[PDB]
Design a protein around this nucleic acid. Structure first.
Ligand SMILES: [Zn+2]
Ligand SMILES: [Zn+2]
Lengths: 54, 103, 172, 111, 45, 69, 172, 306, 24, 83, 43, 332
RNA sequence: AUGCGA
């Protein structure tokens, strides 16, 4: 997706499809394309909660 | 008729409890009243510090802070300012009338 | 803007009481910051101020043709002498008092009469806000244009800047 | 307060016509400094018209450089901003891309 | 009586839904709608 | 448009002083300076008000569409 | 020899007083501002129908002017006003490119201007001859809100002079 | 030590000139904050009576309705502003305007042509009838009480000669202006003074004496009458420092800039109050000082809230 | 070159507040 | 993927980005009726409330620090040096 | 004092997750707008 | 914008009063609220509801659960933007992340233009000539917390390009600091204290003392007199925390000593325990973003203090430029 | 798309 979103979009698309490529959705641009929390900065980690069991 | 409840306000954030440091906020005022009132207030020998500040021209607000020592209260010192301004303006009016008559 | 390409927005409509008043009993129409001149070198504006002041006091128009004057016949001398005959500072300053406090300012303030022009670009009126509006059917994103109640663009560079900040939850 | 001084264009003195003249009023090959564009006049006492044409030359070519520099810096920003946007600090202080490929073992080598 | 002035003859007239949009005194085809005695309030600023 | 009512800078009503001022420049063959001195415009904010005025309304009024021509 | 060195300047550059005293690009920005200035576009404006006009009502003749200001008659179409200007940083809102106006001056009409927008209400803009026609300014069903007469005369056109705000009917 | 009575001992007034439209008076031994207070109040806070709501019924003139309304607002009216109280806003328009708070001025002018002047343009006033609309055409329309109250103070513009509008045959102006009580601070049309300003008394401290033709040559550097020489063989004296304008022209010459100092008297204030005709300038000053006092009474009376 | 001429009616047009040409 | 607690090797300090996300998410929880474990003391801004909760470390949140390998370290607020 | 400066050094380190790539790109681009061998933007 | 920008505020027991009032005000007031979104998902616009109907809804903001499908939610109120929200300002040039910062919203009455402090204009490369700015209002506590903690202006006091301060006072404030800080500038007790309260409002949280403190005059003699450097001492003594010693710095000016006389010494800027003892201040000091005074306060007490110092200086110098002003003319 | 504001 980072290739697609710079230049020769269709050329990078063609080389991607011909590869049967899978996007691991790491590129910040690519991640934006899919509406995903950006992996940089505050999205570099996850937050969980400690909850009482009793 | 009612004692105006919003003209002057005592900013708890800016007022001692012992009794000699307050910031007062008057609505719809500026340097007009402010600089004269601080000027007369500085005549009080018991005022340590007094001054006025406009939070913002567009807001049409006036804050006047009086911090004194334990020999007067800031409310009392302010009343001393206002009694001085009223009597002084009486003096101005009186001499002005006298010289208008003397012509 | 003046006739000197020194354009500025009106930051505020200063109360007449708060303006500075001269010992002539007036408070200026416009106040321009002096620090604008040192980069622009719009000294023609300084001369236009002192010429419009002389010409208003004596009550005559002044000729501003380029090179009517000469290094040996400077405009500061011509309008300086004319103004000084009029009854005003040869350098063109006037003693002003603070509107706010009332003391006399440190120095004589440079006051004069300048042709000022109002640009049609009241970009003040060009303001726009959109918290809700139409969307293009091919995207469901805010439509375009102020008159369309459209939404300003968060461009590619603003995306880059939000990634810079680490503000990935703001970028999302 | 002093003088404007020597006007320049693209790094050198005033253009000269093929007749050898830098302005109609100058004889061909005038060796006067002014004829090359050196303005002795100053803003406080004005500039001669022959000098106003040169300060106008420098001022315009300035406005051209001012209007072209911003087109040569957008592509400089975006061309590598596309590449390093994935590039961040790993939790181990190593610089990894958003792929995971390591770029530097420390930021500038000091963190 | 509603009014319409001829853009080219100044002649006042009172068009109807039953007449040609033309100045009956000159023949022009452009008519300024006349101002009338109609109240408008104004803040003097 | 039309001679301003008051001088922007000072506040003195000036709109009454236009026609007499123009008369003083015509009828009395006075000069603009002396005419303004006799009008009491003794400040340059006032001086300039009338001195610089351009009564463009006379040019506007010839376009009056409410009378035949 | 030149008849006058002004013969090398354009019209607007001669209209700029003391143009030989400013940094050149400030004179060029002066041509762009005076050229972009809201002024008097004409006097037959009641017989034009521009999509927009900007007309300054309080127009004046500069005290400081080129003699080509008279020779080209630009005094027919004054584009500005003579203001009392103090070159002073004092209020704290005059920095970089921002300037202060006197409030009382604006209240007295200083630089007061008006903007005209012309509209065409066409009912054939895309009709289709005899058949198509059927729309007539006016009413028919009575069921309309009679408060529309508060804006539109009983002939379907608004009363010339009417105050209108977004949402008001411009014709029926 | 400072007391208000030591001020009363120290405070002085000297009135140089009292015209029914201008007052030039001095306040000696006061604080700048007080002189500036009086000035500021005389300008913004002293109420005056001015047109506020202009109701047009017709305007066919080449002048914009809004503009003409603002111009009618600017006309100062010769009205004692104490004949009326303020108009509130908390209440409906039917209660807003009464004969106690509003003054009605009608204007109905219809321009015509005159039966054939001499040549042609023989001005405008002879070619046309009511071609010039003046403030003097604002007919005062009383209601009831104030009809009687103004029996001996009818409403007139303080300058009838103000040209308000110029018409052409068939053009007409019909409007009804509602003049209310307002203060110069809320809009400049309510300011009752044209110019209320103060200037500190110029002080010319001659450090060393000058004499002869250098003394008279110094004398010509100042306004005619500021510097007097009686003999000049012994001194060049100051007839009146009040005549000076502080042009600081004397400093242009080394003959003097090292043998004179130019200062001011911080205590001495030279007030100049010129009235727009609504009220006499001294009465305006009286209202300003009584206004400041009334404000101090308002602050005494108010309860400190929290 | 001729120097631009100074005005012939180059005379006082400003006074203090309080004064006039009755002192001139 | 579980980095053993005995083996956590990362910065003992809370990053500004960690602090930002914690305060935002926890504030949002208080604003959605998460039980407040501290005196509201008058406050009405949920964000300032979450800031108070950070000041007393009463926050019941855990930061999952990711490593680009995929291993992560679960860190409590109550240990990560807040500032 | 050496202990203080070491602790300042520990407390001055770049945070995990910093967007240093973008920051780099802007720190080379942004100042290049103010701009025998090729110099400036062409270089 | 204050009446046309909303935040979707979930109503609780702690904000019921404020949101009930905001609803009562309605869309056509200050901190009212334009709309109410139920937990059932439906929207109720207040665009045209009467004070009576909005009053009725104010007593329903806290209603009980109704459907097990919705029992976990609480109603939402679309409140107008107010003085407690952070907003992300961006100026085109984006050229760098520092050109798009988060500012705390202050609704100004009778304005029509986005109002910005001068200290930011060297980071946006913005100038009032006619420059336009985009104002983004984030709709989420995560974006609020980030715009108040990460992107905020104080976190941008230095650029990452070089770490030179990009945020300082400008033009008039610089010349005012040069004039105020001259050994020639003296001030009476009245003037000194007036400038002080003019620049410090303890009621505004502008201090770490909750009262005011003051210095002895420079001149005990004929008359009690304070210097301008004593004023900078008083402001620094009042803005720094009482639990910390005064900043100690030896900086320099952009004004050679030769200009102040043949023996004058005014280029050495000396700060001893919070007290300016020699020299003036200029662009090199609080605007130069190079160790100068403001940079040193940023380093010692951090960005919140340095920002407080900048606002205090901006007010001090603006007011003193009101008392004495600054001008330039042909004589110059 | 053309001109243009920053
Ligand atoms: Zn006709
Ligand atoms: Zn005037």
């Amino acid at each position: 997706f980072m290739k697609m979103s710079y230049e020769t979009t269709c050329q990078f698309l063609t080389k991607a499809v011909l590869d049967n490529e899978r996007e691991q959705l790491d590129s910040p641009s690519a991640r934006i394309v899919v509406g995903k929390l950006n992996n940089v900065g505050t999205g570099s980690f996850d937050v969980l909660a400690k909850v009482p069991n009793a | 008729e009612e004692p105006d409840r919003e003209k002057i306000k005592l900013l708890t954030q800016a007022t001692s409890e012992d009794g000699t440091s307050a910031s007062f906020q008057i609505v719809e005022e500026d340097h007009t009243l402010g600089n004269a009132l601080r000027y007369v207030i500085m005549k009080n020998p018991d005022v340590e510090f007094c001054g006025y500040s406009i939070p913002h021209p567009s807001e049409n607000l006036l804050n006047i802070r009086i911090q004194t020592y334990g020999e007067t209260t800031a409310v009392d010192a302010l009343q001393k300012g206002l009694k001085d301004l009223m009597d002084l303006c009486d003096v101005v009016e009186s001499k002005f009338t006298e010289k208008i008559k003397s012509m | 803007s003046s006739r000197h390409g020194q354009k500025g927005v009106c930051s505020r409509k200063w109360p007449t009481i708060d303006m500075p008043f001269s010992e002539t009993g007036i408070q200026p129409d416009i106040i321009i910051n002096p620090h604008a001149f040192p980069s622009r070198m719009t000294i023609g504006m300084f001369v236009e101020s002192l010429a419009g002041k002389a010409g208003a006091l004596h009550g005559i128009a002044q000729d501003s043709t380029p090179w009517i004057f000469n290094e040996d016949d400077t405009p500061a001398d011509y309008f300086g002498e004319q103004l000084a005959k009029a009854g005003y500072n040869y350098h063109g300053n006037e003693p002003m008092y603070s509107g706010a406090t009332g003391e006399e300012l440190r120095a004589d303030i440079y006051v004069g009469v300048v042709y000022y022009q109002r640009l049609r670009h009241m970009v003040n009126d060009k303001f726009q806000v959109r918290s809700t509006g139409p969307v293009n059917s091919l995207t469901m994103q805010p439509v375009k244009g102020r008159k369309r109640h459209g939404g300003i663009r968060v461009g590619e560079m603003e995306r880059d800047a939000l990634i810079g900040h680490g503000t990935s939850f703001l970028l999302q | 307060m002093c003088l404007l001084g020597q006007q320049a264009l693209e790094g050198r003195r005033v253009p000269v016509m093929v007749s050898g003249k830098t302005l109609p009023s100058f004889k061909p090959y005038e060796t006067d400094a002014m004829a090359g564009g050196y303005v002795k006049g100053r803003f406080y006492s004005g500039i001669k018209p022959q000098e106003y044409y040169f300060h106008c030359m420098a001022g315009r070519e300035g406005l051209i450089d001012t209007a072209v520099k911003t087109s040569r810096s957008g592509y400089l920003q975006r061309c590598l901003t596309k590449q390093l946007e994935g590039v961040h600090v790993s939790y181990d202080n190593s610089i990894r891309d958003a792929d995971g490929t390591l770029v530097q073992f420390m930021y500038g080598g000091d963190a | 009586t509603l009014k319409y002035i001829c853009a080219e003859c100044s002649s006042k007239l009172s068009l109807s839904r039953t007449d040609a949009v033309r100045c009956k005194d000159c023949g022009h085809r452009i008519l300024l709608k006349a101002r009338t005695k109609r109240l408008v309030q104004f803040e003097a600023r | 448009m039309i001679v301003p009512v008051r001088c922007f800078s000072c506040g003195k009503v000036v709109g009454d002083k236009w026609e007499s001022y123009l008369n003083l420049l015509q009828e009395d063959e006075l000069d603009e300076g002396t005419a303004l001195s006799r009008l009491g415009l003794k400040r340059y904010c006032c001086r300039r008000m009338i001195l610089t005025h351009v009564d463009l309304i006379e040019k506007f009024l010839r376009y009056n569409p409410l009378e035949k021509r | 020899v030149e008849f006058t060195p002004t013969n090398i300047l354009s019209i607007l550059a001669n209209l700029t007083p003391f143009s030989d005293f400013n940094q050149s690009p400030r004179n060029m920005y002066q041509c762009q501002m005076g050229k972009q200035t809201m002024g008097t576009p004409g006097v037959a404006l009641c017989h034009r129908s521009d999509n927009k006009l900007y007309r300054l009502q309080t127009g004046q003749t500069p005290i400081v002017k080129a003699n080509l200001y008279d020779d080209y008659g630009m005094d027919n179409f004054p584009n500005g006003f003579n203001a009392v200007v103090a070159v002073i940083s004092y209020t704290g809102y005059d920095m970089d490119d921002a300037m202060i106006i006197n409030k009382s001056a604006d209240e007295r009409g200083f630089g007061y201007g008006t903007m005209y927008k012309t509209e065409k209400v066409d009912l054939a803009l895309n009709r289709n001859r005899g058949d198509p026609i059927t729309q007539h300014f006016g009413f028919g069903n009575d069921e309309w809100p009679k408060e529309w007469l508060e804006k539109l005369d009983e002939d379907g056109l608004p009363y010339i002079g009417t105050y209108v705000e977004e949402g008001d009917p411009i014709c029926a | 030590e400072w007391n208000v009575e030591k001020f009363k001992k120290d405070f002085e007034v000297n009135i140089s000139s009292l015209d029914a439209r201008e007052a030039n008076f001095d306040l000696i031994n006061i604080d700048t904050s007080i002189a500036n207070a009086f000035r500021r109040i005389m300008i913004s806070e002293v109420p005056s009576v001015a047109a506020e709501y202009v109701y047009f019924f017709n305007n066919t003139s080449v002048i914009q309705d809004e503009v003409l309304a603002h111009r009618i607002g600017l006309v100062p009216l010769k009205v004692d502003p104490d004949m009326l109280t303020w108009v509130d806003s908390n209440l409906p328009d039917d209660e807003k305007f009464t004969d106690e708070n509003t003054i009605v001025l009608s204007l109905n002018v219809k321009c015509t042509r005159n039966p054939d002047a001499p040549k042609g343009s023989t001005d405008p006033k002879e070619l046309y009838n009511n071609a010039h609309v003046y403030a003097r055409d604002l007919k005062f329309e009383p209601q009831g009480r104030q009809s009687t109250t103004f029996a001996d103070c009818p409403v007139v513009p303080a300058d009838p000669d103000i040209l308000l509008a110029k018409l052409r045959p068939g053009q007409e102006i019909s409007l009804k202006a509602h003049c209310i009580l307002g203060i110069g601070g809320d809009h400049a049309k309510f300011s009752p003074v044209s110019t209320a300003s103060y200037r500190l008394l110029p002080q010319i401290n001659i450090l060393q004496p000058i004499k002869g033709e250098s003394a008279r040559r110094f004398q010509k550097c100042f306004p005619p009458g500021v510097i007097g020489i009686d003999e000049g063989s012994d001194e060049a004296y100051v007839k009146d420092a009040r005549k000076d304008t502080v042009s600081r022209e004397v400093l242009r010459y080394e003959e003097f800039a090292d043998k004179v100092k130019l200062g001011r008297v911080r205590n001495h204030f030279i007030f100049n109050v010129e009235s727009a005709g609504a009220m006499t300038p001294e009465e305006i000053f009286f209202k300003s000082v009584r206004i400041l006092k009334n404000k101090a009474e308002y602050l005494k009376n108010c309860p400190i809230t929290q | 070159r001729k120097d631009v001429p100074k005005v012939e009616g180059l005379k006082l047009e400003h006074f203090a507040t309080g004064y006039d040409a009755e002192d001139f | 993927k579980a980095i053993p607690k005995d083996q956590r090797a990362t910065t003992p300090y809370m990053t500004k980005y960690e602090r930002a996300r914690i305060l935002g998410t926890r504030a949002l929880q208080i604003s959605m009726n998460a039980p407040v474990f501290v005196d509201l003391e008058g406050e009405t801004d949920p964000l300032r409330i979450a800031m108070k909760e950070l000041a007393e470390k009463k926050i019941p949140l855990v930061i999952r620090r990711y490593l680009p390998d995929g291993s992560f370290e679960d860190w409590s607020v109550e240990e990560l040096i807040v500032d | 004092f050496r202990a203080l400066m070491q602790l300042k050094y520990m407390r001055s380190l770049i945070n995990p997750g910093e967007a240093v790539g973008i920051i780099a790109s802007q720190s080379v681009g942004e100042p290049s707008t103010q701009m025998n061998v090729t110099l400036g933007i062409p270089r | 914008f204050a009446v046309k920008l909303t935040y979707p505020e979930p109503v609780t027991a702690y904000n019921i009063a404020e949101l009930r009032q905001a609803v009562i005000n309605g869309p056509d007031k200050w901190p009212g609220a334009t709309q109410i979104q139920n937990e059932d998902g439906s929207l109720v616009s207040l665009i045209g509801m009467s004070v009576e109907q909005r009053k009725a809804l104010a007593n329903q903001l806290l209603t009980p659960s109704s459907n097990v499908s919705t029992h976990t939610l609480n109603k939402k109120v679309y409140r107008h933007i107010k003085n407690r929200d952070v907003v992300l300002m961006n100026r085109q040039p984006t050229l760098h992340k520092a050109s798009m910062m988060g500012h705390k919203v202050r609704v100004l009455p009778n304005e029509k233009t986005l109002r910005l402090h001068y200290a930011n204009t060297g980071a946006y490369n913005a100038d009032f000539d006619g420059d336009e700015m985009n104002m983004h209002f984030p709709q989420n506590e995560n974006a609020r917390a980030e715009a108040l903690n990460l992107a905020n202006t104080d976190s941008q006091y230095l650029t990452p390009t070089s770490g030179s301060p990009v945020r300082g006072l400008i033009q008039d404030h610089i010349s005012a600091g040069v004039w105020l800080t001259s050994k020639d500038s003296f001030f009476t007790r009245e003037q000194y204290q007036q400038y002080i309260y003019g620049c410090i409002r303890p009621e505004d949280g502008h201090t770490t003392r909750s009262k005011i403190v003051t210095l002895p005059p420079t001149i005990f003699k004929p008359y009690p007199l304070w210097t301008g450097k004593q004023i900078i001492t008083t402001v620094l003594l009042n803005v720094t925390p009482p639990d910390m010693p005064g900043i100690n710095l030896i900086s320099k000016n952009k004004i050679k000593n030769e200009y102040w006389g043949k023996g004058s010494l005014e280029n050495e800027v000396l700060f001893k325990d919070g007290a300016l003892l020699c020299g003036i201040l200029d662009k090199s000091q609080y605007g130069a973003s190079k160790y100068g005074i403001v940079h040193s306060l940023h380093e010692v007490y951090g960005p919140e203090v340095a920002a407080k110092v900048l606002s205090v200086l901006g007010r001090l110098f603006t007011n003193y430029i009101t008392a004495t002003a600054f001008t330039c003319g042909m004589d110059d």
